[PDB]
Structure 1
Amino acid sequence: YGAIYSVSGPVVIAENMIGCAMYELVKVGHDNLVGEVIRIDGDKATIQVYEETAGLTVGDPVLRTGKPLSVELGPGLMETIYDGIQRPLKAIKEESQSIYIPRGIDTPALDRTIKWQFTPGKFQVGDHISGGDIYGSVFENSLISSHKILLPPRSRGTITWIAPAGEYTLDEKILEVEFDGKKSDFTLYHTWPVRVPRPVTEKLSADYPLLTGQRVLDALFPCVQGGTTCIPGAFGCGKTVISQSLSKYSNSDAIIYVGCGERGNEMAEVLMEFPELYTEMSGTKEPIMKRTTLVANTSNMPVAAREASIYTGITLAEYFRDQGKNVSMIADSSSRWAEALREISGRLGEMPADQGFPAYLGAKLASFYERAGKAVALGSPDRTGSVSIVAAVSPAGGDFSDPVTTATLGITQVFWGLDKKLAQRKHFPSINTSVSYSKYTNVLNKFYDSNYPEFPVLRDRMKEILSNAEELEQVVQLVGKSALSDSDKITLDVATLIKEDFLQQNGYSTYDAFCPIWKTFDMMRAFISYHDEAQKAVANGANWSKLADSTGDVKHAVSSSKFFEPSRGEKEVHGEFEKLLSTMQERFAESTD
């Protein structure tokens, strides 16, 4: 077919190509290496390979398979690790004896000899089918039914053969579709392109929250299941602690970890720490390992796996969202995929337009966030699904106001602050009230306020108290303090306790890193009631030391009530928060007089 014209870096150019697309995958070299032609100019097409070049010479045969290069979706996704193309690193670790993917060693997208339990769905002989419909199920990971059998998208017809219940393999057909003749046989696994998005029936608004396990995040703004939010990073300011605490504290049915580039210790520490740690929805054994999907790519891996890792993670998140379950998508980070696209653009020779980044990094980065969200599931059943996209951002263009962080912050809908200076005082993640915003607070306030919501009134006074504490802290150090009012000192003292009990958190404990929504709303309502009681008592005539000494054990119990966990009562609410209001009323009445 084709011939290797020139090889420079990790990308190889092959000429003698006719009728090739921009997404078809072919084998480059004499070892049958995995690759995909991203772009082509004339007769020579440039294809990025998933392995490095360590002896590849020109004049090698390049034969295209005749179809697009994507990942295989089916049973065997959970309890597996893929680098950037869903390749078994455990098989290469035993066979090849190394950790990295070497040239000339390939593997499949899933297991072949592993048999699964096949169960028939709601289809029979002569029943109608469509793309994304529920055709069956897989009995693997028996803690929760996550493996759902779905048909390929853009393909419909009638079910001519209905396989019965029993044991089957991943290489034998059990279903056949007939729509104007025999189109093709269907197996337990299905193929789908990673560079092509998954279609849906219709988009819907977010009306369900997502428990991320953050006291300052859920206390500051209402969480949503299926929203888009960004997280600022500084390369060592508490991003991995919030990522591991957000992944462990997540209560979704599936976990999709997609890493374009990391240091390397976080991938092995997350995989080894994942099968020995129980989350909020954990079970007897394998609570995070059985329900989580591992797609980790390091900095030492190729740029093709790091660039295709976001497409494989978004395709796995859309595949898990198409089944009708709630999945949390954690991406870390977009700066590694933008750095890999800047390395591929620097190797190809494209002129950048992002101050050291690619010109299409803004549209390609903004298009990745648009493919994640809550909506109706594609197919005739029309199930309810959602995908919460949590992607971290970090500036690499040489400034904090670069176009990558501006496009990623403008395209996002949720705001999560993170400062390196505030994280050094043991207050990670230090969120900013002036740069924080949430658009789904009005829609989430109907259902959350319909159940038991009080987050808005204490949240607006908490944000105004944080802005007044920041303005008083900047004006005090700027102008110089020689006196202090009791109203600003009470707001600064309430902002210090709210920043200590809310901003202070960790990613390795559960006593001071786990709090319910009712306990956080009762603590924020108790702090807002104590701030309103101190502000109302200060207006009637009183001192600041007489107000703090009049409060006494109320602020020490409210500040010391953030290290416990729910182990009492028959619900999330506890009796310690209800008894603090009666002592806070007597302490507020005695503090005034």
Structure 2
Amino acid sequence: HAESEYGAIYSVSGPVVIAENMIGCAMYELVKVGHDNLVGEVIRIDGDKATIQVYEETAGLTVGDPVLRTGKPLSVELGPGLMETIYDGIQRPLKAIKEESQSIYIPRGIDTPALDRTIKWQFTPGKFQVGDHISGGDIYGSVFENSLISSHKILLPPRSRGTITWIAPAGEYTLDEKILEVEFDGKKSDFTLYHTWPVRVPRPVTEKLSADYPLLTGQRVLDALFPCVQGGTTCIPGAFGCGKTVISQSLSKYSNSDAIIYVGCGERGNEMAEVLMEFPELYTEMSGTKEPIMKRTTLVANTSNMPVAAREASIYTGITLAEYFRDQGKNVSMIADSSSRWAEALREISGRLGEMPADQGFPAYLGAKLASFYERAGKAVALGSPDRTGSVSIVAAVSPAGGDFSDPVTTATLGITQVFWGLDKKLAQRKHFPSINTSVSYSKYTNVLNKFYDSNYPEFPVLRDRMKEILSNAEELEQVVQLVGKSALSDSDKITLDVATLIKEDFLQQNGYSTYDAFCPIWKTFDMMRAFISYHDEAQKAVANGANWSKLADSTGDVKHAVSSSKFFEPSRGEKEVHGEFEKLLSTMQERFAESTD
């Protein structure tokens, strides 16, 4: 605003831009550089020449192009209207930018508003009285952004506390219009429905709370083996094109949380495009009738074809957005595609800066950002009079080279994570269903998850430990069979191998393209594991009666085909038919016992 604090461009090589004659610019502060007035973030300072990191394309710029420092850190707009809106690395709307530039390409030095100032919404003062003392975090109003989620909270700006002075009446308004005025010791301050929050510091809450509420995965392996609760940190490391993007889409789809913040980093454009095409076609069938997946989520795009710093910037913006969603008193989640692109971006950054590399080209501050991003999310009571309990889950994809755990990504991820879900390329290469290693994937949140699953009086821990033991014993049995042969084992080990195969084909493997196996309910998987355990106990008891495993498997073909047919099933109705089918299975076992004698 005609302040004209400006340094001059000195050295320019690739994405890094060093600008001198500016001592006014701070560290991690926003600055408009070049002749195109491109947004950027200054990193270091040496003498009279401060090193600035550009988050955009530096191609075409020339020496002598002025750089204006704002002096303030990175910030994003928080409030209603950002939902179901695709923001770029500059946090500008993609549709609006493409329409304004009238080109499918990406320009350079472009400036556009986050939300729409011409956008109107119906905002109503939520039970708050004028003159009542208020502070930061309190809801000053409520607006309906979508047809499902209603009353998006307008939060009082940070570092503000006092008494309500002039709070305007409810009605239709925009994001640029002040809906309130608050009097304090700092005299007068204008308050709007939209509040600006720094991207460097996540939106604060009241106090950290223990998360005992399990978040529904929808998948058997994600809910049972390596569990992830609401606010829990679950890693999803995978190989290149191992279905990592697919697992991310499945996770953001079948999620039982309220909102979703998905920030793509260095991912393919066809994935986000397919996401944009299939978002609106899919609609929720739960409460809030007529509501799609697009309106219940927000998408941030940092392309692989985009700038390198755009990934870390969109990641931080997505973190601030998820923190604002967690401060909104709702359970949300962050879906990150290929965090390894941001890590490698950090590697090229520290590398171009002249700093010394250690492992995998990255700097030594990687662990700080990883641990900060992991401990940032969680379940905690938010600020404000509302006193709501918020939740934020962190889901980050790591793409190590060749799927090796020796990669810096895998280690740094596994270090700060309380839960990790691993992806295998063995069953993925065979075009088999979702691949997860039973000898690798584990969760430290599994205990409280067992305590939470006991609320439904399901047995998570028992079935999981029994199946894991059966899996390990069958794996050892596989090592022995591969060692000597299949004729060197006993009836019980063979039963363990057959049960392993049954658990492999009929349980862990579920077709996502199917009209049935695409989504598995809690009761469905619980009943399946229970019926499996019942058939296993019945077979183990029958083998102890002096019957061979093969002879037992001779008349058990019906129960086998029935156990393999539990994947299709039907809607919520007919669970009784399944449990009853299990009863018919035990009865069938009794009939077989009668048949044996004789």
Normalising by the smaller structure, the TM-score range is over 0.9
Query: How far did 1:592 drift?
Result: 8.8
Q: Is the 8 A contact 2:177 2:192 kept in 1?
A: yes
Q: Bigger shift: 569-578 or 11-20?
A: 569-578
Q: CA deviation at 1:287?
A: 1.6
- Cα separation, partners in 2 of 1:10 and 1:559, compared to 1, 3 Å: same
Q: Does 1:42 align with 2:47?
A: yes
Equivalent residue runs for 1:211-290 within 5 Å: 211-279=216-284, 281=286, 284-290=289-295
Give the CA deviation at 1:428: 3.5
* Cα deviation, residue 136, structure 1: 1.0
2:304 maps to what in 1?
299
Q: Is the CA contact 2:145–2:152 (under 8 Å) kept in the aligned structure 1?
A: yes
Residue 235 of structure 2 aligns to a residue whose secondary structure is strand
Taking the aligned partners of 2:74 and 2:259, their CA distance within structure 1 comes to 25
Cα distance between partner residues in 1 of 2:402 and 2:521: 39
Structure 1 pair 554–414 and aligned structure 2 pair: CA distance change class (3 A): same
**Which deviates more, 369-378 or 396-405?**
396-405
Distance 1:410 1:51 in 2: 32
Q: What TM-score, normalized by structure 1, do the two folds share?
A: 0.94
* SS across alignment from 1:566: coil
> Is the 8 Å Cα contact of residues 10 and 63 (structure 2) preserved in structure 1?
yes
Tell me the CA shift for residue 293 of structure 1.
Answer: 0.5
Shift of 1:125: 1.9
| Larger displacement relative to structure 2 (244-253 or 284-293) | 284-293
Contact 1:256 1:316 in 2 (8 A): yes
Taking a change above 3 Å as real, the CA distance of residues 16 and 576 of structure 1, as seen in their structure-2 partners, is farther
CA distance in 2, matches of 1:50, 1:420: 34
Q: Separation in 2 of the partners of 1:397 and 1:530? A: 39
Q: Give the C-alpha shift of residue 280 in structure 1.
A: 6.2
CA distance in 1, matches of 2:104, 2:377: 31
Deviation of 1:142 after TM superposition, in Å, equals 2.4
CA contact (8 A) 2:32 2:40 kept: yes
Contact map agreement 2:512 2:519 (CA 8 A) in 1: no
Question: Does the aligned pair in 1 maintain the 2:284–2:290 contact within 8 Å?
Answer: no
- Per the TM alignment, residue 188 of structure 1 is displaced from its structure 2 partner at its CA by 2.0
Query: Could you tell me whether the CA contact under 8 Å between 1:24 and 1:64 is conserved in 2?
Result: yes
For residues 89 and 168 of structure 1, do their structure 2 counterparts lie closer, same or farther at Cα, with a shift above 3 Å needed? same
Deviation at 1:591?
A: 6.6
Q: CA deviation at 1:166?
A: 0.8
Q: Which moved more, 1:458-467 or 1:377-386?
A: 377-386
Give distance in 2, aligned partners of 1:592 and 1:502: 33
User: How far 1:580 sits from its partner (Å)?
Assistant: 4.2
The Cα shift of 1:292 comes to 0.9
Q: How many angstroms apart in 2 are the aligned matches of 1:498 and 1:579?
A: 20
Q: How far is the alpha carbon of 1:417 from its aligned partner?
A: 2.4
Residue matched to 1:112: 117
CA offsets, 1:392-433, max 9 Å, x none?
Answer: 122249953133211211211112121101322344422222
Which TM-score applies when normalising by structure 2? 0.93
- Given the superposition, is the C-alpha separation of residues 214 and 397 from structure 1 closer, same or farther in structure 2, using an over 3 Å criterion? closer
CA distance, structure 2, for counterparts of residue 356 and residue 479 of structure 1:
46
Q: Determine what percentage of the aligned residue pairs are the same residue.
A: 100
Q: Is the 8 A contact 1:427 1:504 kept in 2?
A: yes
Q: Is the 8 A contact 1:566 1:572 kept in 2?
A: no
> In structure 1, the residue corresponding to 2:284 is in which secondary structure?
coil
Kindly state the Cα deviation for residue 146 of structure 1 after the two structures are TM-superposed.
6.0
What is the CA distance between 1:587 and its match in structure 2?
4.6
1:576, CA displacement in angstroms?
4.4
Residues 338 and 358 in structure 1, CA contact (< 8 A), matched pair in contact too: no
Distance 1:510 1:310, change over 3 A: farther
Structure 2 CA distance, aligned partners of 1:574 and 1:38? 62
Work out whether residues 147 and 291 of structure 2, in 8 Å CA contact, stay in contact via their aligned partners in 1. no
**Who is 1:447 aligned against?**
452
Q: Secondary structure at the match of 1:574?
A: helix
How far is 1:222 from its partner? 4.6
3-state secondary structure, aligned to 2:566 = coil
Query: Measured at CA, do residues 353 and 134 of structure 1 come closer, stay the same or move farther in structure 2, by a change above 3 Å?
Result: same
Of stretches 113-122 and 38-47 in structure 1, the one that deviates more from structure 2 is: 38-47
CA deviation string 1:101-144 (max 9, x = no partner): 31132211111100111110232222122222222111221222
Q: 266-275 or 471-480, which moves further after superposition?
A: 471-480
Whole-Å Cα distance in 2 between the matches of residues 529 and 288 of structure 1?
38
For residues 269-311 of structure 1, give each alpha carbon's deviation from its aligned partner in whole angstroms, at most 9, with x where no partner exists. Answer: 1111111123564865442011010112220001121111111
Q: What SS class does the counterpart of residue 381 from structure 1 fall into?
A: coil
Partners of 2:578 and 2:374 in 1: how far apart? 36
Quote the Cα distance in structure 2 between the aligned partners of 1:287 and 1:242: 20
Cα distance in 2, alignment partners of residues 345 and 575 from structure 1: 63
Single out whichever of 443-452 and 334-343 deviates more from structure 2: 443-452
Q: Deviations over 1:229-250 (max 9, x none)?
A: 1112111112222222111111
Quote the Cα distance in structure 1 between the aligned partners of 2:236 and 2:315. Answer: 17
8 A contact 1:417–1:429 mirrored in 2: no
2:55/2:313 contact within 8 Å kept: no
Work out the CA distance in 2 between the residues paired with 1:33 and 1:366.
31
Q: CA deviation at 1:439?
A: 2.2
The answer for unaligned runs of 5 or more in structure 1 is: none
1:384 deviates by 0.5
Per-residue CA deviations over 1:45-65 (Å, capped at 9, x if unaligned) read 222333212321122222222
Q: 2:594, 2:446 → 1: CA distance?
A: 35
**Cα displacement (A) at 1:577:** 4.9
Call closer, same or farther: CA 1:494–1:426 in 2, change over 3 Å: farther
Structure 1 residue 568, shift from structure 2 partner: 2.2
- Is the Cα–Cα contact under 8 Å of residues 40 and 55 in structure 2 kept in the other structure? yes
The alpha-carbon distance between structure 1 residues 582 and 293, as it changes in their structure 2 partners (threshold 3 A), is: farther
* In structure 2, C-alpha distance between the alignment counterparts of 1:592 and 1:108, rounded to whole Å: 81
Tell me how far 1:575 sits from its aligned partner: 5.2
1:533-576 C-alpha deviation (Å, 9 max, x unpaired): 21222122111211212322112111111023325249998654
Q: Show the counterpart of 2:78.
A: 73
Distance in 1, Cα, partners of 2:294 & 2:513: 17
Q: How far is 1:367 from its partner?
A: 1.3
Residue 558 and residue 146 in structure 1: after superposition, are their counterparts in 2 closer, same or farther (change >3 A)?
Answer: farther
From the superposition, tell whether residues 171 and 414 of structure 1 become closer, same or farther in structure 2 (CA, over 3 Å).
Answer: same
Q: Quote how far apart the aligned CAs of 1:215 are.
A: 2.2
- Tell me if structure 1 keeps the 8 A contact 2:227–2:419: no
- Alignment check: 8 A CA contact 1:534 1:588 kept: no
CA offsets per residue over residues 441-500 of structure 1, 9 Å max, x none? Answer: 222323321322112211111001111121211222234444332111111111111111
**CA distance in structure 1 between the partners assigned to 2:191 and 2:70 by the alignment:** 19
Equivalence map 1:483-494=2 (5 Å)? 483-494=488-499
Structure 1 pair 344/544, CA: closer, same or farther in 2 (3 Å)?
A: same
Q: Secondary structure at 1:65's aligned position in 2?
A: strand
The answer as to 2:348 corresponding to 1:343 is: yes
**Mean CA deviation greater in 187-196 or 438-447:** 438-447
CA pair 191-575 structure 1, distance change in 2 beyond 3 A: farther
User: Which residue number in structure 1 is paired with residue 3 of structure 2?
Assistant: none
Task: Please give the per-residue CA displacement for 1:479-529, whole angstroms capped at 9, x wherever unaligned.
Answer: 444433211111111111111122212333341121111110110011112
Instruction: Assess if the C-alpha contact under 8 Å between 1:540 and 1:592 holds in 2.
Output: no
Q: Report the CA distance shift for 1:405/1:486 in structure 2 as closer, same or farther (over 3 A).
A: same
Aligned equivalents of 1:159 and 1:215: distance in 2? 51
Cα 1:576–1:246, aligned 2, differ >3 Å: closer, same or farther? farther
